[PDB]
């Protein structure tokens, strides 16, 4: 297009509208498969960049170049069906390993209608604040105990709390009886 008509914005708008229209006139199962493939691609590129050292820079550069076509999905039901799989894969990515996720969300942000992916990161920040509050509470309780009395080698455990609004957890992944499958200090 740039070769045929020179640099103009209206032709770029025509190109985007054409891609959108081509996407629309497709059967449902095809659209679902397409969304799943897009999400899987993004996840694979990010994971490879994080684990792969020497060619990971090439993968990340290609990812930043390739993000632009995916923005066509904004303003379609494909956005709704694509947010779902992005949620599922990003959950595992965040649990297993970050900072590149925010960078990606800074340019793919508009595509997600219900904005759940950003809500997940907000949840992580809230959990950190909660841990700090918990430490302060422990210190306060120890102070009260010492006041009452005087009025006359360990595993490091960090706890992460998630909201149910914006986090997919299958109820098959739950843990029901802690003492049944855990040591005593951890349970305490």
């Amino acid at each position: 297009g740039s070769e045929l008509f020179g640099p103009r914005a209206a032709f770029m708008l025509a190109l985007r509208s054409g891609f959108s229209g081509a996407l629309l006139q497709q059967s449902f199962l095809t659209a679902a498969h397409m969304s799943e493939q897009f999400a899987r691609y993004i996840d694979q590129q990010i994971q490879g960049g994080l684990i792969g050292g020497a060619p990971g820079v090439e993968m990340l550069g290609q990812l930043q170049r390739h993000l632009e076509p995916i923005m066509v999905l904004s303003g379609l039901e494909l956005a709704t069906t694509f947010e779902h799989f992005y949620q599922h894969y990003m959950a595992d990515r965040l649990l297993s390993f970050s900072w590149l996720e925010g960078a990606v969300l800074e340019q793919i942000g508009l595509c997600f209608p219900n904005r759940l992916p950003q809500l997940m990161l907000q949840s992580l920040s809230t959990s950190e604040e909660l841990q700090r509050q918990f430490h302060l509470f422990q210190l306060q309780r120890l102070d009260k105990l010492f006041l009452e009395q005087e009025d006359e080698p360990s595993p490091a455990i960090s706890i992460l709390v998630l909201s149910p609004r914006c986090w997919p957890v299958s109820p098959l992944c739950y843990l029901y009886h802690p003492r049944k499958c855990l040591p005593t200090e951890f349970c305490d």
């Binding site: 649990l95 595993p155 455990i157 960090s158 706890i159 998630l162 909201s163 149910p164 986090w167 951890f186």
Partner: peptide, 14 residues
């Protein structure tokens, strides 16, 4: 035995 050096637990709220 096997010694733990750090653990990260995950919970939801209902």
């Amino acid at each position: 035995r096997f010694e733990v050096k750090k653990w990260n637990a995950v919970a939801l709220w209902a």
